Amino acid sequence: VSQPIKLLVGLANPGPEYAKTRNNAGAWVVEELARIHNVTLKNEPKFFGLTGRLLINSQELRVLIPTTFMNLSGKAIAALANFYQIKPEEIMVAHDELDLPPGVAKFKQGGGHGGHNGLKDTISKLGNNKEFYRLRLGIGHPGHKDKVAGYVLGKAPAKEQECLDAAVDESVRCLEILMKDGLTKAQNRLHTFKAE
């Protein structure tokens, strides 16, 4: 009956070269949610990104995919949140997560960036507030700390992308349930999912 999320953001590097790289996982969630719910995203330069508004259980969800550099994602998030008066606590940020494997996704309230550039800037531009929700989509991590950025800015191989594509799908279904049954039941379901 009741839930705190008014803005779902899917983080991304801009353009066709990046559309299918791992660092765009967040956007994949927002893109798919929006296709399912028939909304076409509008490029609004004042919000440095692609935005839209959805009705899910007669509840209003705004969605955003920044067109900024990943590390300036906070410009878009803040400009939009502040225009519509959305507090951080009411924002969910969907984003690639190194500390989880492909095929897994998790909700979380709060925490750090884990060296994710988008999250850092989002914390920062939200006036150093980390209390926004996150949708952590596992992308695995590479062998070495130094290989991370290439991994993250690279395309997953086919087999691994199916696990990612299924975590995306389930994340979306659990966002639909979030709006209908709340955070707890949405979470209960998502956290039993491991892509087969």
From Swiss-Prot:
<comment type="subunit">
    <text>Monomer.</text>
</comment>
<dbReference type="InterPro" id="IPR018171">
    <property type="entry name" value="Pept_tRNA_hydro_CS"/>
</dbReference>
<dbReference type="GO" id="GO:0006515">
    <property type="term" value="P:protein quality control for misfolded or incompletely synthesized proteins"/>
</dbReference>
<keyword id="KW-0694">RNA-binding</keyword>
<feature type="binding site">
    <location>
        <position position="71"/>
    </location>
    <ligand>
        <name>tRNA</name>
    </ligand>
</feature>
<comment type="function">
    <text>Hydrolyzes ribosome-free peptidyl-tRNAs (with 1 or more amino acids incorporated), which drop off the ribosome during protein synthesis, or as a result of ribosome stalling.</text>
</comment>
<keyword id="KW-0963">Cytoplasm</keyword>
<dbReference type="GO" id="GO:0004045">
    <property type="term" value="F:peptidyl-tRNA hydrolase activity"/>
</dbReference>
<feature type="binding site">
    <location>
        <position position="69"/>
    </location>
    <ligand>
        <name>tRNA</name>
    </ligand>
</feature>
<dbReference type="Pfam" id="PF01195">
    <property type="entry name" value="Pept_tRNA_hydro"/>
</dbReference>
<feature type="active site" description="Proton acceptor">
    <location>
        <position position="23"/>
    </location>
</feature>
<feature type="binding site">
    <location>
        <position position="117"/>
    </location>
    <ligand>
        <name>tRNA</name>
    </ligand>
</feature>
<dbReference type="InterPro" id="IPR036416">
    <property type="entry name" value="Pept_tRNA_hydro_sf"/>
</dbReference>
<keyword id="KW-0820">tRNA-binding</keyword>
<feature type="site" description="Stabilizes the basic form of H active site to accept a proton">
    <location>
        <position position="96"/>
    </location>
</feature>
<feature type="site" description="Discriminates between blocked and unblocked aminoacyl-tRNA">
    <location>
        <position position="13"/>
    </location>
</feature>
<keyword id="KW-0378">Hydrolase</keyword>
<comment type="function">
    <text>Catalyzes the release of premature peptidyl moieties from peptidyl-tRNA molecules trapped in stalled 50S ribosomal subunits, and thus maintains levels of free tRNAs and 50S ribosomes.</text>
</comment>
<dbReference type="GO" id="GO:0000049">
    <property type="term" value="F:tRNA binding"/>
</dbReference>
<dbReference type="GO" id="GO:0072344">
    <property type="term" value="P:rescue of stalled ribosome"/>
</dbReference>
<dbReference type="InterPro" id="IPR001328">
    <property type="entry name" value="Pept_tRNA_hydro"/>
</dbReference>
<dbReference type="GO" id="GO:0005737">
    <property type="term" value="C:cytoplasm"/>
</dbReference>
<protein>
    <recommendedName>
        <fullName>Peptidyl-tRNA hydrolase</fullName>
        <ecNumber>3.1.1.29</ecNumber>
    </recommendedName>
</protein>
<feature type="binding site">
    <location>
        <position position="18"/>
    </location>
    <ligand>
        <name>tRNA</name>
    </ligand>
</feature>
<comment type="similarity">
    <text>Belongs to the PTH family.</text>
</comment>
